[PDB]
Scaffold this active site. Structure first.
Site, PDB file in Angstrom:
ATOM      1  N   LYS A 191     -24.115   4.731 -17.427  1.00 15.47           N
ATOM      2  CA  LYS A 191     -23.011   3.529 -17.402  1.00 15.47           C
ATOM      3  C   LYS A 191     -21.724   4.242 -17.537  1.00 15.47           C
ATOM      4  O   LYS A 191     -20.895   3.709 -16.379  1.00 15.47           O
ATOM      5  CB  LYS A 191     -23.345   2.809 -18.581  1.00 15.47           C
ATOM      6  CG  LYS A 191     -22.380   1.636 -18.659  1.00 15.47           C
ATOM      7  CD  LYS A 191     -22.417   1.176 -20.129  1.00 15.47           C
ATOM      8  CE  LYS A 191     -21.335  -0.367 -20.262  1.00 15.47           C
ATOM      9  NZ  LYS A 191     -20.206  -0.087 -20.865  1.00 15.47           N
ATOM     10  N   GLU A 233     -23.736  -3.505 -13.066  1.00 16.67           N
ATOM     11  CA  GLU A 233     -24.693  -2.187 -12.627  1.00 16.67           C
ATOM     12  C   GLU A 233     -25.011  -2.469 -11.345  1.00 16.67           C
ATOM     13  O   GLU A 233     -24.958  -3.532 -10.638  1.00 16.67           O
ATOM     14  CB  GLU A 233     -25.731  -1.967 -13.517  1.00 16.67           C
ATOM     15  CG  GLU A 233     -27.110  -3.005 -13.314  1.00 16.67           C
ATOM     16  CD  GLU A 233     -28.249  -2.543 -14.299  1.00 16.67           C
ATOM     17  OE1 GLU A 233     -29.025  -1.772 -14.565  1.00 16.67           O
ATOM     18  OE2 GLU A 233     -28.030  -3.508 -15.600  1.00 16.67           O
ATOM     19  N   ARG A 270     -32.301   0.786  -5.691  1.00 20.40           N
ATOM     20  CA  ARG A 270     -33.671   0.397  -5.052  1.00 20.40           C
ATOM     21  C   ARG A 270     -33.683  -0.950  -4.497  1.00 20.40           C
ATOM     22  O   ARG A 270     -32.802  -1.846  -4.678  1.00 20.40           O
ATOM     23  CB  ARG A 270     -34.693   0.569  -6.112  1.00 20.40           C
ATOM     24  CG  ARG A 270     -34.356  -0.207  -7.236  1.00 20.40           C
ATOM     25  CD  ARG A 270     -35.184  -0.527  -8.182  1.00 20.40           C
ATOM     26  NE  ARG A 270     -34.800  -1.247  -9.541  1.00 20.40           N
ATOM     27  CZ  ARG A 270     -34.838  -2.353  -9.785  1.00 20.40           C
ATOM     28  NH1 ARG A 270     -35.576  -3.514  -8.791  1.00 20.40           N
ATOM     29  NH2 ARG A 270     -34.328  -3.161 -10.737  1.00 20.40           N
ATOM     30  N   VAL A 289     -36.968  -6.996  -6.695  1.00 17.66           N
ATOM     31  CA  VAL A 289     -38.075  -8.046  -6.797  1.00 17.66           C
ATOM     32  C   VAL A 289     -37.577  -9.065  -5.866  1.00 17.66           C
ATOM     33  O   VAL A 289     -38.328  -9.554  -4.733  1.00 17.66           O
ATOM     34  CB  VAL A 289     -38.140  -8.546  -8.156  1.00 17.66           C
ATOM     35  CG1 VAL A 289     -39.292  -9.780  -7.870  1.00 17.66           C
ATOM     36  CG2 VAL A 289     -38.891  -7.482  -9.099  1.00 17.66           C
TER      37      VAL A 289
END
EC number: 6.3.4.14
Lengths: 428, 433
Positions: free
Chosen positions: B115, B275, B279, B282
């Site tokens: 973070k 954030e 990748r 979904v």
């Protein structure tokens, strides 16, 4: 918007119409034969009515029975789908006369286009390219006769012997008597989608190539047509649209042409929705059934030609319950079923696991449509999709479809109307 | 790329397998013993059982995955989402072992995975972050109020529940906050009713990066995404270009490679970075519908070393797409609800896309997550997309187990969801959680 409508059809097309209705908030009434109680759309309709026994003549072709179901349900319109009474003038006439809205052109329009004569006549008057000929029977003046053949352009056909040069004319004609027409040895089947609102507006939605045929029955359809340029597209499209206006056409319709050497030759007009309309929806984004419904509700054409854009490429493979080697219908119980899925994969079918395909009707059970940014992509998706599809219990033509996708010629594009039969050895 | 290993399971594994197939890439499916029957496993070119059921023992087992790649002669590994996708050690090992990792470099994963580091990096690239006092607060009320005025009330005082809404309570909350808690305190902008808007990027690892519009994922339950849509309602082309450009810049700046997503809180016309998912996500299909880009294929092209095929100017937003996740779960607890699917029917139609490995007779294992499918509908507009989703949900049949289909239908029927722009707390409020 039409409050409620009757779906005078069955199988795939009935389900396609049902979904369009539901999207627009139109109530649905499914009329069915005693043998189609279990059809998927029947199960999803707001109301249902059994219109007769199995045989279409007794059910699906029973006019009074369908008009009645309209009346007792309070339906405002009837959607004939394709096949059946979709191109039946009497039917349309009756429907209206009975106070209902026929989701199609006027009965006059159907008669007009129903007869081959009145049809070409209208098309020529309209400016649409028809097959060139003698324009009436021929005589004895071969000095004369040969003059028209020149005009026509060899090869010609005497009707039926084929001639290629001045030389064979004489005998050809002589041994014949024992009209003339331009001959198309290797044509493609190209058809144009149109929509007209009856209110003077008409647009065309590009074209589709349906050359893959067996017994004059389309097996694979694609859009757009490979090799057709924008100019050609615009030329024919404009002409088809003009014809619509000229003939006072209303609804969805398709102008079918033979295409050869940069030229088109009118074959006929389908005064209704076609089986293969999905390929057009994919590349233009227009939902054709919804437009049908809107035009029916008295709404003007929502789309402007300049707004019609062709993007990507789409292919359709018809899935039939038939023996791939005999080509004999294959009715029966589907024991196991798995539909393909994924990006650009569209499956249109009423079938489900445990469903029984009656023997009374036609053999088409589903349509698999794949879209891609280009033809190669569309094709690649089709292949994958065909491999995911599972249909056990009956024989289907899935393997044949896969073989076509795998044909070099097909993959290259441009195959003609004869190719399939020929690839199969159906020429004998 | 010649052959790859799909280091995942379920829907995403099938998603990837279809992309490799279209591309002509050879497939190797690694599975746990409990996953012998997954649809993708049955369709793969090569299969390898990597372990027993439990993930820790199969899916999370690094050395098993690597060995499967060696023996099959694979050139790369696709981690999918979840599992090891954002595991830097894994990415690192993969590469050091001689395989291409289909994702960003390990270092990038590490960087964005912390973070502190992440925020640090975004500030740098000009990515909007949550405003704050940027360091502990002093005992000068004059400057403290100045900081709070700068950030904009409401604010929250955090020590190293009170909502400060104005100057009158500032002093007291700060004191009170120290009195309670080292002992230093900090101030941060309070975001009461934000939406969750995330930006989709692709970077080739060679200086090129593009943004592919955004997605609204505000319908969540207990912090879990339930429904996703694209584009985000109320986002102008200007606002889109503004954040999009910022995000593409950050990519270059950090040397990002592959697909990634920047998630933000959106409130009162502003974006605030939360954030970065290093990748594929979904919910990627809703982006594919409206842009027409196959994200999974691009991830493979990129991994093959191709630079981006698409130019920003070529990215167009057309229509609207809505995604409903379908899960096999306990309606009270939300835990998986495993078992045999007795009857199954998928919805079809124009603009209807179904992403799922399930099938009639297939058994949902208790070992993993509850997600069993994704239904996505597209329309020329949002309203059409919703209508289509309503109908599709009605045609869908999944017997033998408990699913969230009814909840999805209720959501599609919600007047507020239909109006659009609900915030992140709406779902639970509606559900009474």
């Amino acid at each position: 918007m039409l409050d409620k409508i009757v779906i005078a059809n069955r199988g795939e097309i009935a389900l396609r119409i049902l979904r369009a209705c539901k999207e627009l908030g139109i109530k649905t009434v499914a009329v069915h034969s005693s043998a189609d109680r279990d059809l998927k759309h029947v199960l999803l309709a707001d109301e249902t009515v059994c219109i007769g026994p199995a045989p279409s003549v007794k059910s699906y072709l029973n006019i009074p029975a369908i008009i009645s179901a309209a009346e007792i349900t309070g339906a405002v319109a009837i959607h004939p789908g394709y096949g059946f009474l979709s191109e039946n003038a009497n039917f349309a006439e009756q429907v209206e006369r009975s106070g209902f809205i026929f989701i199609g052109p006027k009965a006059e329009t159907i008669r007009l286009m129903g007869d081959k004569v009145s049809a070409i006549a209208a098309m020529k008057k309209a400016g649409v390219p028809c097959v060139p000929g003698s324009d009436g029977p021929l005589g004895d003046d071969m000095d004369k006769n040969r003059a028209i053949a020149k005009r026509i352009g060899y090869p010609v056909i005497i009707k039926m012997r084929v001639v290629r040069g001045d030389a064979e004319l004489a005998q050809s004609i002589s041994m014949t008597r024992a009209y003339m027409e331009k001959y198309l040895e290797n044509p493609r089947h190209v058809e144009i989608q149109v929509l007209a609102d009856g209110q003077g507006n008409a647009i065309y939605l590009a074209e589709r190539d349906c050359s893959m045929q067996r017994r004059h029955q389309k097996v694979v359809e694609e859009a757009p047509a490979p090799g057709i340029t924008p100019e050609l597209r615009r030329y024919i499209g404009e002409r088809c649209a003009k014809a619509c206006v000229d003939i006072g056409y209303r609804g969805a319709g398709t102008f079918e042409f033979l295409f050869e050497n940069g030229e088109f030759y009118f074959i006929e007009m389908n005064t209704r929705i076609q089986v293969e309309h999905p390929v057009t929806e994919m590349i233009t984004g227009v939902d054709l059934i919804k437009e049908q419904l809107r035009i029916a509700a008295g709404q003007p054409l929502s789309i402007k030609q300049e707004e019609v854009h062709v993007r990507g490429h789409a292919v359709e493979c018809r899935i039939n319950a038939e023996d791939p080697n005999t080509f004999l219908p294959s009715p029966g119980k589907i024991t196991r079923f798995h539909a393909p899925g994924g990006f650009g994969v569209r499956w249109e079918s009423h079938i489900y696991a445990g469903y029984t395909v009656p023997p009374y009707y036609d053999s088409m059970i589903g349509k698999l449509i794949c879209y891609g940014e280009n033809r190669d992509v569309a094709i690649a998706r089709m292949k994958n999709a065909l491999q995911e599809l599972i249909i056990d219990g009956i024989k289907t033509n899935v393997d044949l479809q896969i073989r076509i996708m795998n044909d070099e010629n097909f993959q290259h594009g441009g195959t003609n109307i004869h190719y399939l039969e020929k690839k199969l050895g159906l020429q004998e």
